[PDB]
Amino acid sequence: MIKEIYLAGGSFWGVEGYFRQIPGVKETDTGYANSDHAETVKIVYDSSVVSLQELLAHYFRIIDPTSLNKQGNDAGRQYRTGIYYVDDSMIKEINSFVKFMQKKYSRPIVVEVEKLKHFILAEDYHQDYLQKNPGGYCHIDLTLALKPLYDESKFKVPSKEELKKSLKPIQFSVTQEKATERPFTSEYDKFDAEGIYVDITTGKPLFSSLNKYDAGCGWPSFTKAITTQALQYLEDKSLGMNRTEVVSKTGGAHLGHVFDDGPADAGGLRYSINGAALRFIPYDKMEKEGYGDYLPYVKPTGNF
Amino acid sequence: MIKEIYLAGGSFWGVEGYFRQIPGVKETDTGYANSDHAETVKIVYDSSVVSLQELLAHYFRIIDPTSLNKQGNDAGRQYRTGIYYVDDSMIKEINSFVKFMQKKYSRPIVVEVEKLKHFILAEDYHQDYLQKNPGGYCHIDLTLALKPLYDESKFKVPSKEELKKSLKPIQFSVTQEKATERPFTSEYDKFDAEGIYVDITTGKPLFSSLNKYDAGCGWPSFTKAITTQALQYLEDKSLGMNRTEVVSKTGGAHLGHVFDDGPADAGGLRYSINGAALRFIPYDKMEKEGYGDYLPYVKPTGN
């Protein structure tokens, strides 16, 4: 579904410049929200591509959530940090994520969470400012939007030969030879436990149990990727058809195919992925195995 | 807020060609919805500009809601009429509007209302087909999108001199001389009855009571126009400020100004309109006075 969220993180020039580079974002607008108005960027996005969880993850990545009325050298009430909603269904998701982020800070997070009550659209001069004036001021490092959102230092790919002895034949065949496991053979087919599905070759998270559903086609099926940085798409005319191949962006390993016959309310996308290409990690064991940053993708309104 | 609705009304080439011309529509996509799929167009729109009511009004305008599995010369299950939702909050509005339209047809309406279950995006060939291929087939008259949605024959404009005898001085001043009534002086300021507000010079509907709220600035305030065909906007550098002037599209009469400090949940627009420029018509008398087509704009549910 198309959704919208309002984020105030300092000078909206950099904030818009960052989020405009993120997949799933369909429209950005700079303005003044909630006199002493905060500089805010309106974010219109497709939840089937990028989740609210990832958007808030990006948001906290480019701000100091412990700083009051000041981001970088820009000080004042117009630079206060805040997350403003127009959709009341987002309230528990937003609150849970802030509580989630608090666990990473000794100092109390001062990002305000309020219902958007006014949003005054800025002049065309301020709209796509850094696009019109590339030499413009920008505290945020815009190149970060094209860089990993999470620590991927541990998700490096082994060579061809390590994988051949480490993986089972079906695992190597699927990931390294674009093979396809036979339907209903994977343990992850009829499976609904809470947790994340990880790249069996690199350990990088690819899918969440929250997006998993029964397509009845015999393969693990998902409505979306866990992040916008997980997958890459390739034209595939194999077997005399026209299909899109799904591959790990980091790994490069073959995962499966993505179709357009998924549940329409979830975006209409069906990610058909071989179970052999995935390693399931239970929610309870996620934090201990180093996947603490991916908890909100499993439980958007989870207890933190 | 940005919202989306799915409409199946025959060959999606014409359906998309029509709705792409309607203000508030931000994105259109042709595809196959709910094997036996119906030809459907995905409509992404801004509810602050165009309401679901107007969109459904346009939809019924370009289709035969009594015809089963056939629109024009296109026959088959892929041409069946239907309205598909992904937002459950729209269900009662859609159902109410279909019941509303039934009163205009002797034969039963066969347009199906279902929750969207699948939507398969059509190839780029079928996307903006009539835009790429202007000689393409199209049952719908696309010029209708640039023509009045409702009968505007009774909304004729008098010349200045008739209005000079018909209107009160303050009504003439506001509408014909761009004057501004003093704050809190209009009866429509503190006013909350259900109905529509029409152009005092033409009788054409401009605003709905459902979109009315108290801005506390002393003037009748609205979050949006009743239709996309009601208002026209003009740059106004009056009084050394930067403002947008609101004028009747049909009349041309001055109504007021539109600001961006409105309630954000309603779209963030504040339409500040002089009460002197408006004539209020109660919901109970709307149908009797010939405004039966504008009922869903007041009461989206219940019809």
UniProtKB/TrEMBL annotation, chain A:
<dbReference type="InterPro" id="IPR036509">
    <property type="entry name" value="Met_Sox_Rdtase_MsrA_sf"/>
</dbReference>
<keyword id="KW-0511">Multifunctional enzyme</keyword>
<comment type="similarity">
    <text>In the N-terminal section; belongs to the MsrA Met sulfoxide reductase family.</text>
</comment>
<dbReference type="GO" id="GO:0030091">
    <property type="term" value="P:protein repair"/>
</dbReference>
<comment type="function">
    <text>Has an important function as a repair enzyme for proteins that have been inactivated by oxidation. Catalyzes the reversible oxidation-reduction of methionine sulfoxide in proteins to methionine.</text>
</comment>
<dbReference type="GO" id="GO:0033744">
    <property type="term" value="F:L-methionine:thioredoxin-disulfide S-oxidoreductase activity"/>
</dbReference>
<dbReference type="GO" id="GO:0005737">
    <property type="term" value="C:cytoplasm"/>
</dbReference>
<dbReference type="InterPro" id="IPR002579">
    <property type="entry name" value="Met_Sox_Rdtase_MsrB_dom"/>
</dbReference>
<dbReference type="GO" id="GO:0006979">
    <property type="term" value="P:response to oxidative stress"/>
</dbReference>
<comment type="similarity">
    <text>Belongs to the MsrA Met sulfoxide reductase family.</text>
</comment>
<dbReference type="InterPro" id="IPR011057">
    <property type="entry name" value="Mss4-like_sf"/>
</dbReference>
<dbReference type="GO" id="GO:0008113">
    <property type="term" value="F:peptide-methionine (S)-S-oxide reductase activity"/>
</dbReference>
<keyword id="KW-0560">Oxidoreductase</keyword>
<feature type="active site">
    <location>
        <position position="11"/>
    </location>
</feature>
<dbReference type="Pfam" id="PF01641">
    <property type="entry name" value="SelR"/>
</dbReference>
<dbReference type="Pfam" id="PF01625">
    <property type="entry name" value="PMSR"/>
</dbReference>
<protein>
    <recommendedName>
        <fullName>Peptide methionine sulfoxide reductase MsrA</fullName>
        <ecNumber>1.8.4.11</ecNumber>
    </recommendedName>
</protein>
<dbReference type="InterPro" id="IPR028427">
    <property type="entry name" value="Met_Sox_Rdtase_MsrB"/>
</dbReference>
<feature type="domain" description="MsrB">
    <location>
        <begin position="160"/>
        <end position="283"/>
    </location>
</feature>
<dbReference type="InterPro" id="IPR002569">
    <property type="entry name" value="Met_Sox_Rdtase_MsrA_dom"/>
</dbReference>
<dbReference type="GO" id="GO:0033743">
    <property type="term" value="F:peptide-methionine (R)-S-oxide reductase activity"/>
</dbReference>
Automatic annotation (TrEMBL), chain B:
<keyword id="KW-0560">Oxidoreductase</keyword>
<dbReference type="InterPro" id="IPR002569">
    <property type="entry name" value="Met_Sox_Rdtase_MsrA_dom"/>
</dbReference>
<comment type="function">
    <text>Has an important function as a repair enzyme for proteins that have been inactivated by oxidation. Catalyzes the reversible oxidation-reduction of methionine sulfoxide in proteins to methionine.</text>
</comment>
<dbReference type="GO" id="GO:0005737">
    <property type="term" value="C:cytoplasm"/>
</dbReference>
<feature type="domain" description="MsrB">
    <location>
        <begin position="160"/>
        <end position="283"/>
    </location>
</feature>
<dbReference type="Pfam" id="PF01641">
    <property type="entry name" value="SelR"/>
</dbReference>
<feature type="active site">
    <location>
        <position position="11"/>
    </location>
</feature>
<dbReference type="GO" id="GO:0033743">
    <property type="term" value="F:peptide-methionine (R)-S-oxide reductase activity"/>
</dbReference>
<keyword id="KW-0511">Multifunctional enzyme</keyword>
<dbReference type="InterPro" id="IPR036509">
    <property type="entry name" value="Met_Sox_Rdtase_MsrA_sf"/>
</dbReference>
<comment type="similarity">
    <text>Belongs to the MsrA Met sulfoxide reductase family.</text>
</comment>
<dbReference type="GO" id="GO:0033744">
    <property type="term" value="F:L-methionine:thioredoxin-disulfide S-oxidoreductase activity"/>
</dbReference>
<comment type="similarity">
    <text>In the N-terminal section; belongs to the MsrA Met sulfoxide reductase family.</text>
</comment>
<dbReference type="InterPro" id="IPR002579">
    <property type="entry name" value="Met_Sox_Rdtase_MsrB_dom"/>
</dbReference>
<dbReference type="GO" id="GO:0030091">
    <property type="term" value="P:protein repair"/>
</dbReference>
<protein>
    <recommendedName>
        <fullName>Peptide methionine sulfoxide reductase MsrA</fullName>
        <ecNumber>1.8.4.11</ecNumber>
    </recommendedName>
</protein>
<dbReference type="InterPro" id="IPR028427">
    <property type="entry name" value="Met_Sox_Rdtase_MsrB"/>
</dbReference>
<dbReference type="GO" id="GO:0006979">
    <property type="term" value="P:response to oxidative stress"/>
</dbReference>
<dbReference type="GO" id="GO:0008113">
    <property type="term" value="F:peptide-methionine (S)-S-oxide reductase activity"/>
</dbReference>
<dbReference type="Pfam" id="PF01625">
    <property type="entry name" value="PMSR"/>
</dbReference>
<dbReference type="InterPro" id="IPR011057">
    <property type="entry name" value="Mss4-like_sf"/>
</dbReference>
